[PDB]
Symmetry: D2
Subunit: 198 residues, 4 copies
Amino acid sequence: KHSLPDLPYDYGALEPHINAQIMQLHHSKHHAAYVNNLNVTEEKYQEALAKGDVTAQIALQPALKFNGGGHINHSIFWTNLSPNGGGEPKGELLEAIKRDFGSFDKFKEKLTAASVGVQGSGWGWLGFNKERGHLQIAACPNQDPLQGTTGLIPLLGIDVWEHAYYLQYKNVRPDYLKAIWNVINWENVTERYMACKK
Amino acid sequence: KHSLPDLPYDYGALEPHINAQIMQLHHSKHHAAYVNNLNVTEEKYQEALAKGDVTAQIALQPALKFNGGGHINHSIFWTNLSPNGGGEPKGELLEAIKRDFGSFDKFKEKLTAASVGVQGSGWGWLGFNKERGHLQIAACPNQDPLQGTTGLIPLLGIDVWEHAYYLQYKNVRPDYLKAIWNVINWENVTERYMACKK
Amino acid sequence: KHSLPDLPYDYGALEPHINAQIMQLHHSKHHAAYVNNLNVTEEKYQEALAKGDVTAQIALQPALKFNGGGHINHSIFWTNLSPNGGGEPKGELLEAIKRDFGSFDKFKEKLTAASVGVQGSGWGWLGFNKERGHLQIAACPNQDPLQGTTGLIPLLGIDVWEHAYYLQYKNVRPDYLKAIWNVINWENVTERYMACKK
Amino acid sequence: KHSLPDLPYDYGALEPHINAQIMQLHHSKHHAAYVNNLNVTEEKYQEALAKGDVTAQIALQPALKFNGGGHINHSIFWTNLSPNGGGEPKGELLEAIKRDFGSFDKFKEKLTAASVGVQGSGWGWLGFNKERGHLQIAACPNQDPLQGTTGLIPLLGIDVWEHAYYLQYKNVRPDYLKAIWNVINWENVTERYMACKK
Ligand SMILES: [Mn+2]
Ligand SMILES: [Mn+2]
Ligand SMILES: [Mn+2]
Ligand SMILES: [Mn+2]
């Protein structure tokens, strides 16, 4: 049975880039709901799978992907941020970025665009294509998880649902984007990245 | 473990409206594949559900809905057709049609339109809305099953994937539509309908 | 040339159900942006259409549906609300609601459910089905407009994008839905309904 | 005014890989229909655009993408094939394939997989990513065109709508994919590729 992971920091450990109220609601309410509903959906599915009830299985897919995705996406997002974040990555990760996107700067401009380009709710991602052996940027709608729906390995995600910035940045998503770069835990992204090299 | 149901008639029992080659390929190859792939997907899912692997569960959804839907949809379609079909329904079913669509004729014109209106692969359906307590026509893309994705109870389905008519009607889907009315097993639809009244 | 319509009342006219900050931002920022991007996209589409550039036309569809839908939806929304609204509709609208949903309360629960059920951004609608000649509830994703994507004529819409309630209700979408019933302009809903008897 | 382009060879020029009946039907019937509906839809769109009818514009999008995409896709497809084709591409295209996919064989398996993997109707494509400056494989549903919906520049397309192979290969899509490699016009694929170095 899935559970809500604790934050590697305090609700206000990302200020002023992301005020405490956001982190609090985002973690304790939003993520909590996705976890809670994920467990319920899984149980219902197990029961449906046991009876060989295809219609019931299919009818549960939306709730599974949404809440399951929500759980996956936010769990990663918490580790992608840190009071000790900011700046630029070093070593291989940095070399890969310049390699695949030209420069760290162009990389940012690309991920920012993918993130700002989401119409409605969704996420912007920097992932790893194991097949092509290189980095790849992609956007996902609502809570659709990167790996489950694209196959790409999530390295860094940027939540662009309005609940991720509205209380502080209101309608100006671009400001949120520019600010979040200050709390990116490149240490964790590098770990996720290095895990792909193999 | 799901299995491929036998036809309530012979592969050529629907001629000339639907030649034997179609019925043969459609049942033994197409439906068979959906069943075969459905069992495999379910097993993989059970294993994924056992480990609490959300990404794996989500990644399997497409195959589940497609093959599961394929199994559901074709199983119904076989019972919706019959060498003893054709003509018009009688009793309550017929009264419901005139009630909800005006006349049996307008009903046909409506279901034919929904069926011909499908861009790409899909199905046209005459279903029952338990909530509204009346008949409702709807179209579904690819193998997405009616009940699992809309909640409507399937009463009559019209396969409009090209494999359902190309060998005989080629690109003229309208001809297939006009012809299939001759083999509709209204006896079975009435049964499905009466099961909804409760 | 499309234009941002003036609200039929002041930003604080809907207090305390929907506060002034939300109304001001929702109208002067959100709707304003949809209007300009709609105009720009229409102009770009005219140029593509004149040159017969099918690829350019198709590439513009997302922005056209998103911004055009955004304009259509919010224009209707403002008229659906009023400081002198709330309670139950008078006249035939109420009778149509009783007939198609059982009662006003059941209707309220169904539209609330449809609205709360939107995963991600979207809208909940009470619409009119011209074909069936009766009321029908539907939910639309992001800014996809009701009539243009479903054929249903919009009567009452409930915006469930997080920007419609976050500054006031936070994550509690249900409290927002509960409060909005207090400001529904049934006079406007009835006008939209009566125009469908055509 | 869009027009049905003449094939660069006779209907039987691709035998026995793709027979004459399929080529004749695919071109004179399928593509012909997409062309006329594209023209009609464009004209209807101009009228809606002139009146600023956003709902009408949005309602026309499905037909525009479907028929416009159908025209774009088949126009490219015909040029991608040749009686004098098959084998491996010569020049830089082959080197780009080796670089981005490892080898020609691996590339063939990937495009075959992407094509066979389409659930329902669609297309498999080898495209060029201008941003990343490299080759990329993608699959598109129904008639959604590659460039207009993904930004990738189409180099080689494989039609996997059942009408592209049913009269000859029946349900065995894999045999169709195997046979088509024998008629690929690499000269055309290379031209499309070289135009991307711009
Ligand atoms: Mn979030
Ligand atoms: Mn079928
Ligand atoms: Mn809004
Ligand atoms: Mn085709």
